[PDB]
Amino acid sequence: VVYSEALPFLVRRESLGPVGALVGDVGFDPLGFTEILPLAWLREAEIKHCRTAMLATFGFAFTDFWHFPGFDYTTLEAHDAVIAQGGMSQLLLWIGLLEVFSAISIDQMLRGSGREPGDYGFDPLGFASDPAKKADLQMKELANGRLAMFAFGGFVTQSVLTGNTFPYLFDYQTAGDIVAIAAQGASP
Amino acid sequence: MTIPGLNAPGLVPATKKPAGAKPSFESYRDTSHFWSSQGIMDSVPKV
Amino acid sequence: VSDMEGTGPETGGKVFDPMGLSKIASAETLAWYRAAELKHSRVAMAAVTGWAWVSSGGPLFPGYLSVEQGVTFESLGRDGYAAWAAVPEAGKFQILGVIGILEILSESAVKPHYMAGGTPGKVPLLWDPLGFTAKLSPETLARKRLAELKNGRLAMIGVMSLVSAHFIPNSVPLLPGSV
Amino acid sequence: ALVDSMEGVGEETGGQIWDPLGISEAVSDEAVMWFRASELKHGRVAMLASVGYLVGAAKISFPGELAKGVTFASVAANGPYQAWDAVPQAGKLQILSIILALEWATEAKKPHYMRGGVPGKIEQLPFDGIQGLWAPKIKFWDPLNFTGALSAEQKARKRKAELKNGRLAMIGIISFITGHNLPGSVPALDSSF
Amino acid sequence: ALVDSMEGVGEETGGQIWDPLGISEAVSDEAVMWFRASELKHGRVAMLASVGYLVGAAKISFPGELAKGVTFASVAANGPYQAWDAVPQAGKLQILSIILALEWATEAKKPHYMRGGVPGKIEQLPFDGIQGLWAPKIKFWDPLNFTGALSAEQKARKRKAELKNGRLAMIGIISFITGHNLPGSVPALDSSF
Ligand SMILES: CC(=O)O[C@H]1CC(C)(C)C(=C=C/C(C)=C/C=C/C(C)=C/C=C/C=C(C)/C=C/C=C(\C)C(=O)C[C@@]23O[C@]2(C)C[C@@H](O)CC3(C)C)[C@](C)(O)C1
Ligand code: KC2
Ligand code: KC2
Ligand SMILES: CC1=C(C#C/C(C)=C/C=C/C(C)=C/C=C/C=C(C)/C=C/C=C(C)/C=C/[C@@]23O[C@]2(C)C[C@@H](O)CC3(C)C)C(C)(C)C[C@H](O)C1
């Protein structure tokens, strides 16, 4: 009897596949989406979300500090401002070309071409060319991206909630004492 | 125009406010694209 | 510790360690003790020589120290502590930073480390660029290393006498009350 | 591992495992290892804390500036308890950052104190063998290698001394905190505390 | 490993590879070739920039005019930092176009460095072998063939010197720019630069 290594009180499901066909298989699937959707589709979505979240959190943090001379907008209003300007239309156009090609690849992979879940073959610099390092780098990619999703969510939500630029921390957290030991009052 | 790097700076420092109180929930919900009437009316394509 | 050099006729051929700090010292601890002794001795030798030259009346550096900001070698004065107070903070930071870079190079670049089975006090770049102590035999080189240790121990006591005269006034004789 | 083989049984409690409650009997072996690791952590933390609190109460402070415009005397003048609040936020942020690094590194070593490691024996060079991280090989414990000049029996005796000093240190630091909070709870603590 | 067979190892880090974070250990060999090529390109660009920035800081300039209205002294007057901004647009475009030609011709060599060729050994004649394109055969590096007089061991020692000087200039030029940006960040730079 195989128990999920992330939830040892649940039996592995079945649709998750052999234990370890996918880097990161810690058997984390309490809600059993693998029964409804195919694992290859789900993993392609996973890596797409990972990569997009990575780029998004880095771009948010970067735009909090630096912007190009033309774009004089803050990170929150940049979306509206550059839709009005027209740049986001260009991003949508080019990412849509790339995404049409990507969707063709997902169709082929699901119909049985042989392509892996998120293997676009993008490897110019030669990272992970050695097969020994490839699985470890896939696992590192997944770990970093799954962290980056929460990173970007916290970035945006705390940014709007606080109104502060980089740290996304309230004024009392930034200025006052977050490691105090003398008895506090009613407000921070 | 301003070619970034040739006839202008490259990356330009952003304008920032030095900390501040929490904006009220109704301050940004009433301007959000999905939970504001005017925000919804402005969250449409253009051509 | 008995086979670590630094002993001489001044102790009587025996190790001077009354408090017994050598008993609780391993090979690595003893190497650390010798490395710290060598570094402190060298620093104190340089410090005493500089302070004596500056305060005694020797011909100090000509020219300006900072053309802009108008600080001059003559203007800094001959009191050592006042001179180190009046030298620019940029100059102080620069001296400290270069010393730090040299310390980190001494720690890392000398790969057989003095703690991990190496020679204590073997800062590789900062020694004999002109090759003077190149043809000396091991016997005279050991004699000169013992000379380094002895002279620098005296120099440490000298510089502490100087700062004691500056802080606790009229403390050490043969040091005028000011400094 | 098991309480019979573990150290710490002193003379103060009659050459016997001092477990008035049935905690050791009720719990399993790896729970005992966790308790021993936590006991040593508490004793060491409290030893450092007690010495630092006594220094702060005595008002002995380094000659210089804790921060530009903030002197060690300035933060220490009000007392030991208030000095931590008087410290600027960035300094104790750095302290808690390095403590986070130390704790995570010590926990990341694979022969874990719960899973076949000596409980209380913190791995020296905790930042070694970690990819994407380089630190100088300065041992966490005994960087000067003081314990190298000790025998196994002497080291066991000094481990017993460690435990029996750490327990006193926990008692003392809680005494200091309780005396400051509720005055009169702990006598021998004058207004300086 | 390809990282074990290069000239960049220097006694300044002992007789051992300087990879504190294991970046070279976490990548395949092709990325190591790319790393060496980019390292040497960065180093060389950095030393060009460092000596140029020192020359600009000294207010040294050619006798003549960089355009028909600007003087070399005039465009150098403000300082090295604003000198590039004050350069005329067409000159900047021409520098960028010739650098484009160089880094396209050097890239378009089929032995390459990522795919089975010496990293950092830019092909001495980038624009030769290009069909329907003509260049005067001024070989890019050693146009007057200094290194021909050297033996193999001599040029190996000088390749080590190249790596050392390129890394030092990598530090130095950024020191110049950072000192200009943050005053006092690099105290060795006066207000002139
Ligand atoms: C009664 C009373 O209270 O008195 C007071 C007053 C009094 C006595 C003044 C006091 C004091 C202070 C004192 C006495 C301080 C002493 C300081 C001292 C002893 C300072 C040494 C420096 C050595 C240096 C810089 C050597 C460099 C040497 C070098 C660079 C070399 O060795 C190089 C080289 O040689 C080699 C290795 C190889 C050879 O081929 C030749 C060469 C050149 C190539 C006290 C303590 O306050 C007490
Ligand atoms: C756990 C121990 C500890 C370690 C290992 C450690 C290491 C490093 C390193 C690494 C090599 C650097 C480079 C560095 C730098 C600075 N540290 Mg720091 N530090 C530690 C502790 C404290 C405390 C308690 C304070 C403090 C501070 C500063 C300031 C002052 C800035 C200022 O003048 O405002 C600067 C620049 C003070 C502060 O932030 O004051 C607002 C302050 O109170 N640090 N610190
Ligand atoms: C290494 C880089 C480089 C190369 C290889 C290169 C080659 C050639 C060739 C041959 C192939 C010709 C025929 C040519 C001609 C002119 N160059 Mg040019 N040039 C380079 C760099 C610069 C810079 C930095 C500037 C510049 C300029 C001019 C002007 C002045 C016009 C004037 O008087 O306004 C004229 C006529 C200046 C400029 O653009 O001035 C507006 C200016 O600042 N060039 N340049
Ligand atoms: C990687 C990946 C994916 C992804 C992705 C993502 C989100 C990528 C995002 C990329 C991004 C965000 C790229 C921005 C570029 C910006 C440029 C070039 C700006 C030009 C700007 C120009 C030409 C001009 C600007 C001006 O201001 C100037 C200088 C002068 C002013 O007068 C006004 C104007 C406006 C004219 C998929 C496809 C979704 C799935 C796949 O699985 C994995």
mmCIF file of N, CA and C in Angstrom, chain C residues 89-137:
data_model
loop_
_atom_site.group_PDB
_atom_site.id
_atom_site.type_symbol
_atom_site.label_atom_id
_atom_site.label_comp_id
_atom_site.label_asym_id
_atom_site.label_seq_id
_atom_site.Cartn_x
_atom_site.Cartn_y
_atom_site.Cartn_z
ATOM 1 N N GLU C 89 37.256 60.927 6.880
ATOM 2 C CA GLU C 89 36.582 59.645 7.039
ATOM 3 C C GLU C 89 36.738 58.785 5.795
ATOM 4 N N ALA C 90 36.830 59.407 4.618
ATOM 5 C CA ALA C 90 37.123 58.650 3.407
ATOM 6 C C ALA C 90 38.479 57.966 3.510
ATOM 7 N N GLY C 91 39.492 58.684 3.998
ATOM 8 C CA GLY C 91 40.803 58.077 4.160
ATOM 9 C C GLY C 91 40.810 56.964 5.190
ATOM 10 N N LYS C 92 40.104 57.166 6.307
ATOM 11 C CA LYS C 92 40.014 56.117 7.319
ATOM 12 C C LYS C 92 39.340 54.874 6.755
ATOM 13 N N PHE C 93 38.217 55.063 6.059
ATOM 14 C CA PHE C 93 37.521 53.941 5.443
ATOM 15 C C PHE C 93 38.412 53.247 4.427
ATOM 16 N N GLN C 94 39.214 54.013 3.692
ATOM 17 C CA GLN C 94 40.063 53.405 2.674
ATOM 18 C C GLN C 94 41.163 52.564 3.301
ATOM 19 N N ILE C 95 41.815 53.093 4.339
ATOM 20 C CA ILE C 95 42.849 52.333 5.036
ATOM 21 C C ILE C 95 42.258 51.047 5.597
ATOM 22 N N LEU C 96 41.111 51.164 6.273
ATOM 23 C CA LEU C 96 40.484 49.990 6.872
ATOM 24 C C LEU C 96 40.054 48.983 5.811
ATOM 25 N N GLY C 97 39.524 49.460 4.684
ATOM 26 C CA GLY C 97 39.079 48.552 3.641
ATOM 27 C C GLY C 97 40.220 47.819 2.967
ATOM 28 N N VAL C 98 41.329 48.517 2.709
ATOM 29 C CA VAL C 98 42.483 47.844 2.125
ATOM 30 C C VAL C 98 43.047 46.824 3.104
ATOM 31 N N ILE C 99 43.102 47.174 4.393
ATOM 32 C CA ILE C 99 43.557 46.209 5.392
ATOM 33 C C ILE C 99 42.619 45.008 5.433
ATOM 34 N N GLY C 100 41.316 45.243 5.269
ATOM 35 C CA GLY C 100 40.368 44.139 5.261
ATOM 36 C C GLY C 100 40.542 43.227 4.064
ATOM 37 N N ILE C 101 40.746 43.820 2.886
ATOM 38 C CA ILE C 101 40.994 43.029 1.684
ATOM 39 C C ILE C 101 42.245 42.185 1.871
ATOM 40 N N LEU C 102 43.294 42.778 2.442
ATOM 41 C CA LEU C 102 44.521 42.029 2.681
ATOM 42 C C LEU C 102 44.309 40.918 3.704
ATOM 43 N N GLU C 103 43.502 41.172 4.737
ATOM 44 C CA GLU C 103 43.213 40.134 5.723
ATOM 45 C C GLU C 103 42.487 38.960 5.084
ATOM 46 N N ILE C 104 41.476 39.240 4.268
ATOM 47 C CA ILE C 104 40.716 38.184 3.593
ATOM 48 C C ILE C 104 41.573 37.454 2.561
ATOM 49 N N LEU C 105 42.514 38.126 1.914
ATOM 50 C CA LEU C 105 43.448 37.447 1.023
ATOM 51 C C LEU C 105 44.406 36.561 1.807
ATOM 52 N N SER C 106 44.868 37.027 2.968
ATOM 53 C CA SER C 106 45.720 36.194 3.809
ATOM 54 C C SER C 106 44.971 34.960 4.289
ATOM 55 N N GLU C 107 43.683 35.115 4.597
ATOM 56 C CA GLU C 107 42.898 33.981 5.076
ATOM 57 C C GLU C 107 42.679 32.949 3.978
ATOM 58 N N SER C 108 42.270 33.394 2.789
ATOM 59 C CA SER C 108 41.805 32.493 1.738
ATOM 60 C C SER C 108 42.907 32.065 0.777
ATOM 61 N N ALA C 109 43.721 33.012 0.303
ATOM 62 C CA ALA C 109 44.687 32.715 -0.750
ATOM 63 C C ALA C 109 45.729 31.705 -0.290
ATOM 64 N N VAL C 110 46.156 31.786 0.968
ATOM 65 C CA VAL C 110 47.109 30.820 1.495
ATOM 66 C C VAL C 110 46.328 29.544 1.763
ATOM 67 N N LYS C 111 46.312 28.644 0.775
ATOM 68 C CA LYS C 111 45.377 27.521 0.831
ATOM 69 C C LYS C 111 45.694 26.556 1.964
ATOM 70 N N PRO C 112 46.944 26.124 2.182
ATOM 71 C CA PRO C 112 47.211 25.393 3.426
ATOM 72 C C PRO C 112 47.113 26.361 4.588
ATOM 73 N N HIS C 113 45.999 26.300 5.304
ATOM 74 C CA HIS C 113 45.659 27.325 6.274
ATOM 75 C C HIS C 113 46.397 27.069 7.578
ATOM 76 N N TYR C 114 46.760 28.160 8.254
ATOM 77 C CA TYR C 114 47.515 28.034 9.496
ATOM 78 C C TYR C 114 46.728 27.279 10.558
ATOM 79 N N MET C 115 45.398 27.364 10.523
ATOM 80 C CA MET C 115 44.591 26.540 11.415
ATOM 81 C C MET C 115 44.524 25.100 10.923
ATOM 82 N N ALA C 116 44.397 24.909 9.610
ATOM 83 C CA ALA C 116 44.298 23.575 9.016
ATOM 84 C C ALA C 116 45.675 23.088 8.558
ATOM 85 N N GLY C 117 46.603 23.044 9.509
ATOM 86 C CA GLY C 117 47.934 22.538 9.237
ATOM 87 C C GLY C 117 48.728 23.400 8.279
ATOM 88 N N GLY C 118 49.096 24.604 8.714
ATOM 89 C CA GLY C 118 49.879 25.512 7.904
ATOM 90 C C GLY C 118 50.766 26.371 8.778
ATOM 91 N N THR C 119 51.564 27.209 8.129
ATOM 92 C CA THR C 119 52.468 28.097 8.847
ATOM 93 C C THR C 119 51.707 29.333 9.320
ATOM 94 N N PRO C 120 51.605 29.596 10.628
ATOM 95 C CA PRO C 120 51.003 30.868 11.053
ATOM 96 C C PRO C 120 51.851 32.056 10.630
ATOM 97 N N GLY C 121 51.173 33.135 10.251
ATOM 98 C CA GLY C 121 51.847 34.337 9.802
ATOM 99 C C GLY C 121 52.612 34.136 8.511
ATOM 100 N N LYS C 122 51.898 33.827 7.431
ATOM 101 C CA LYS C 122 52.473 33.620 6.103
ATOM 102 C C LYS C 122 51.683 34.418 5.071
ATOM 103 N N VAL C 123 51.486 35.704 5.346
ATOM 104 C CA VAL C 123 50.793 36.583 4.409
ATOM 105 C C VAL C 123 51.655 36.664 3.152
ATOM 106 N N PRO C 124 51.211 36.130 1.998
ATOM 107 C CA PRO C 124 52.164 35.857 0.913
ATOM 108 C C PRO C 124 52.636 37.089 0.156
ATOM 109 N N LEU C 125 51.714 37.980 -0.217
ATOM 110 C CA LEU C 125 52.104 39.149 -0.999
ATOM 111 C C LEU C 125 52.922 40.111 -0.154
ATOM 112 N N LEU C 126 52.451 40.399 1.058
ATOM 113 C CA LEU C 126 52.999 41.481 1.869
ATOM 114 C C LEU C 126 54.253 41.014 2.611
ATOM 115 N N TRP C 127 55.242 40.566 1.841
ATOM 116 C CA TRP C 127 56.520 40.225 2.442
ATOM 117 C C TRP C 127 57.636 40.153 1.411
ATOM 118 N N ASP C 128 58.616 41.045 1.533
ATOM 119 C CA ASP C 128 59.869 40.950 0.796
ATOM 120 C C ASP C 128 59.661 40.967 -0.716
ATOM 121 N N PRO C 129 59.051 42.019 -1.270
ATOM 122 C CA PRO C 129 58.929 42.089 -2.735
ATOM 123 C C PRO C 129 60.267 42.167 -3.447
ATOM 124 N N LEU C 130 61.299 42.698 -2.793
ATOM 125 C CA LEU C 130 62.623 42.835 -3.385
ATOM 126 C C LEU C 130 63.515 41.624 -3.130
ATOM 127 N N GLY C 131 63.020 40.610 -2.422
ATOM 128 C CA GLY C 131 63.764 39.376 -2.272
ATOM 129 C C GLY C 131 64.927 39.416 -1.308
ATOM 130 N N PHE C 132 64.938 40.347 -0.348
ATOM 131 C CA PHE C 132 66.061 40.445 0.582
ATOM 132 C C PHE C 132 66.242 39.162 1.385
ATOM 133 N N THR C 133 65.165 38.671 1.995
ATOM 134 C CA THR C 133 65.231 37.468 2.834
ATOM 135 C C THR C 133 64.917 36.224 2.002
ATOM 136 N N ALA C 134 65.662 36.081 0.907
ATOM 137 C CA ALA C 134 65.509 34.970 -0.020
ATOM 138 C C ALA C 134 66.616 33.936 0.084
ATOM 139 N N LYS C 135 67.867 34.361 0.257
ATOM 140 C CA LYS C 135 69.011 33.462 0.327
ATOM 141 C C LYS C 135 69.421 33.121 1.754
ATOM 142 N N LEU C 136 68.731 33.652 2.762
ATOM 143 C CA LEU C 136 69.069 33.329 4.142
ATOM 144 C C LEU C 136 68.814 31.854 4.422
ATOM 145 N N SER C 137 69.725 31.241 5.176
ATOM 146 C CA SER C 137 69.605 29.836 5.513
ATOM 147 C C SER C 137 68.507 29.652 6.559
#
